Amino acid sequence: KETAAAKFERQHMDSSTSAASSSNYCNQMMKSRNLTKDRAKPVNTFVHESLADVQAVCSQKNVACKNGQTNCYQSYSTMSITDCRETGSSKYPNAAYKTTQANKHIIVACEGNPYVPVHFDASV
């Protein structure tokens, strides 16, 4: 089965591009990352930074997670991200996603050894 670190890379990492190219980016990526198979994941965020830069956030600002967990870290600088959200009219399997590109700090929960990101908590 998939490890938590590998699942985080598959669902959130997109270092091949510097930002969402078009409004079809989310439809494209949600499908090729396997996030619309048993159902469509309604919300997902992609980070357009190198994997080393995203793993480095686990040694940056330690903050509380949205669920009260204390293993979340906020990046010191902003990062290029793309928010993919299902529209009120998306019907599985024909999942329609709105793509919103932005520059913000990311907040991730880190775990294990090596200490790496395993959950995307939010962005600010």
Side-chain angles (χ1 to χ4, degrees), residues 11-12 26 30 35 39-46 82-87 96-98 120-122:
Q11 298 192 126
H12 301 294
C26 282
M30 292 303 278
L35 291 156
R39 33 72 268 262
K41 198 166 165 221
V43 181
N44 187 59
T45 296
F46 283 106
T82 294
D83 173 273
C84 291
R85 186 149 303 215
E86 228 178 74
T87 54
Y97 284 91
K98 175 202 190 30
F120 191 93
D121 203 61

Coordinates of all heavy atoms in Angstrom, one line a residue, residues 11-12 26 30 35 39-46 82-87 96-98 120-122:
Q11 N -0.5 13.4 -4.3 CA -1.6 14.3 -4.3 C -1.3 15.8 -4.3 O -2.1 16.6 -4.7 CB -2.4 14.1 -2.9 CG -2.9 12.7 -2.8 CD -3.9 12.7 -1.7 OE1 -5.0 12.3 -1.8 NE2 -3.5 13.1 -0.5
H12 N -0.1 16.2 -3.8 CA 0.1 17.7 -3.8 C 1.4 18.2 -4.5 O 1.6 19.4 -4.6 CB 0.3 18.0 -2.3 CG -0.9 17.7 -1.5 ND1 -2.1 18.3 -1.7 CD2 -1.1 16.7 -0.5 CE1 -3.0 17.8 -0.8 NE2 -2.4 16.8 -0.1
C26 N -6.5 22.0 -13.3 CA -7.1 21.1 -12.2 C -7.8 19.9 -12.8 O -7.6 18.8 -12.3 CB -8.1 21.9 -11.4 SG -7.1 22.9 -10.2
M30 N -6.0 16.5 -11.6 CA -6.8 15.6 -10.7 C -7.0 14.2 -11.3 O -7.0 13.2 -10.6 CB -8.2 16.2 -10.4 CG -8.1 17.5 -9.6 SD -7.3 17.3 -8.0 CE -8.7 16.6 -7.0
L35 N -6.9 11.1 -8.6 CA -7.7 11.6 -7.5 C -9.3 11.6 -7.9 O -10.1 12.1 -7.1 CB -7.2 13.0 -7.2 CG -5.9 13.0 -6.5 CD1 -5.1 14.3 -6.7 CD2 -6.0 12.7 -5.0
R39 N -14.0 8.1 -6.7 CA -14.9 9.3 -6.6 C -14.0 10.5 -6.9 O -12.8 10.3 -7.1 CB -15.4 9.4 -5.1 CG -14.4 8.8 -4.1 CD -13.2 9.8 -4.0 NE -12.1 9.4 -4.9 CZ -11.1 8.6 -4.5 NH1 -11.4 7.6 -3.8 NH2 -9.9 8.9 -4.8
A40 N -14.5 11.6 -6.9 CA -13.6 12.8 -7.2 C -13.3 13.4 -5.8 O -14.2 13.7 -5.0 CB -14.4 13.8 -8.1
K41 N -12.0 13.6 -5.6 CA -11.7 14.3 -4.3 C -12.2 15.8 -4.6 O -11.9 16.4 -5.6 CB -10.1 14.3 -4.1 CG -9.8 14.6 -2.7 CD -8.3 14.3 -2.4 CE -7.8 14.9 -1.1 NZ -6.4 15.4 -1.3
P42 N -13.1 16.3 -3.7 CA -13.8 17.6 -4.0 C -12.8 18.8 -3.9 O -13.0 19.7 -4.6 CB -14.9 17.7 -2.9 CG -14.4 16.7 -1.8 CD -13.5 15.6 -2.5
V43 N -11.8 18.7 -3.1 CA -10.8 19.8 -2.9 C -9.4 19.3 -2.8 O -9.2 18.3 -2.1 CB -11.2 20.6 -1.7 CG1 -10.2 21.8 -1.5 CG2 -12.6 21.2 -1.7
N44 N -8.5 19.9 -3.6 CA -7.1 19.4 -3.5 C -6.1 20.6 -3.8 O -6.5 21.4 -4.7 CB -6.8 18.2 -4.4 CG -5.4 17.7 -4.2 OD1 -5.1 17.3 -3.1 ND2 -4.6 17.7 -5.1
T45 N -5.0 20.7 -3.2 CA -4.0 21.8 -3.6 C -2.7 21.2 -4.1 O -2.1 20.3 -3.6 CB -3.7 22.6 -2.3 OG1 -5.0 23.2 -1.9 CG2 -2.7 23.7 -2.6
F46 N -2.2 21.8 -5.2 CA -0.9 21.4 -5.8 C 0.1 22.5 -5.5 O -0.2 23.7 -5.5 CB -1.1 21.3 -7.3 CG -1.8 20.0 -7.6 CD1 -3.1 20.0 -8.1 CD2 -1.1 18.7 -7.5 CE1 -3.8 18.8 -8.4 CE2 -1.8 17.5 -7.8 CZ -3.1 17.6 -8.3
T82 N -1.7 25.9 -6.4 CA -3.0 25.9 -7.2 C -4.0 25.2 -6.4 O -3.9 24.0 -6.1 CB -2.7 25.2 -8.6 OG1 -1.8 25.9 -9.4 CG2 -4.1 25.1 -9.3
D83 N -5.1 25.9 -6.2 CA -6.3 25.2 -5.5 C -7.2 24.6 -6.5 O -7.6 25.3 -7.5 CB -7.0 26.3 -4.6 CG -8.2 25.8 -4.0 OD1 -9.3 25.9 -4.6 OD2 -8.2 25.4 -2.9
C84 N -7.6 23.4 -6.4 CA -8.5 22.6 -7.3 C -9.8 22.3 -6.5 O -9.7 21.7 -5.5 CB -7.9 21.3 -7.8 SG -6.5 21.6 -8.8
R85 N -10.9 22.9 -6.9 CA -12.1 22.7 -6.1 C -13.3 22.3 -7.1 O -13.5 22.9 -8.2 CB -12.5 24.1 -5.5 CG -13.7 24.0 -4.6 CD -13.5 25.0 -3.5 NE -12.3 24.7 -2.7 CZ -12.2 24.9 -1.4 NH1 -13.2 24.7 -0.7 NH2 -11.0 25.2 -0.9
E86 N -14.0 21.3 -6.7 CA -15.2 20.9 -7.6 C -16.2 22.0 -7.7 O -16.5 22.7 -6.7 CB -15.8 19.7 -6.9 CG -16.0 18.6 -7.9 CD -16.5 17.3 -7.2 OE1 -17.7 17.3 -6.8 OE2 -15.8 16.4 -7.0
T87 N -16.8 22.2 -8.8 CA -17.9 23.3 -8.9 C -19.2 22.7 -8.4 O -19.3 21.5 -8.2 CB -18.1 23.7 -10.4 OG1 -18.3 22.5 -11.1 CG2 -16.8 24.4 -10.9
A96 N -15.8 18.3 -12.8 CA -15.4 19.6 -13.3 C -14.7 20.4 -12.1 O -15.2 20.4 -11.0 CB -16.6 20.4 -13.7
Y97 N -13.5 20.9 -12.3 CA -12.8 21.6 -11.2 C -12.5 23.0 -11.5 O -12.0 23.3 -12.6 CB -11.4 20.9 -10.9 CG -11.6 19.6 -10.2 CD1 -11.8 18.4 -10.9 CD2 -11.6 19.6 -8.8 CE1 -11.9 17.2 -10.2 CE2 -11.8 18.3 -8.1 CZ -11.9 17.1 -8.8 OH -12.1 15.9 -8.2
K98 N -12.6 23.9 -10.6 CA -12.2 25.3 -10.8 C -10.8 25.4 -10.4 O -10.4 24.9 -9.3 CB -13.1 26.2 -9.8 CG -12.7 27.7 -9.9 CD -13.2 28.4 -8.6 CE -13.0 29.9 -8.6 NZ -13.2 30.4 -10.0
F120 N -1.6 18.1 3.9 CA -1.6 19.5 3.5 C -2.7 20.1 4.4 O -3.9 19.7 4.3 CB -2.0 19.6 2.0 CG -1.7 21.1 1.6 CD1 -0.5 21.5 1.1 CD2 -2.8 22.0 1.8 CE1 -0.3 22.8 0.7 CE2 -2.6 23.4 1.4 CZ -1.3 23.7 0.9
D121 N -2.3 20.9 5.4 CA -3.4 21.4 6.3 C -4.1 22.6 5.7 O -5.3 22.7 5.8 CB -2.7 21.9 7.6 CG -3.7 21.8 8.7 OD1 -4.2 20.8 9.0 OD2 -3.9 22.9 9.3
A122 N -3.4 23.6 5.2 CA -4.0 24.8 4.7 C -3.0 25.7 4.0 O -1.8 25.4 4.1 CB -4.7 25.5 5.9

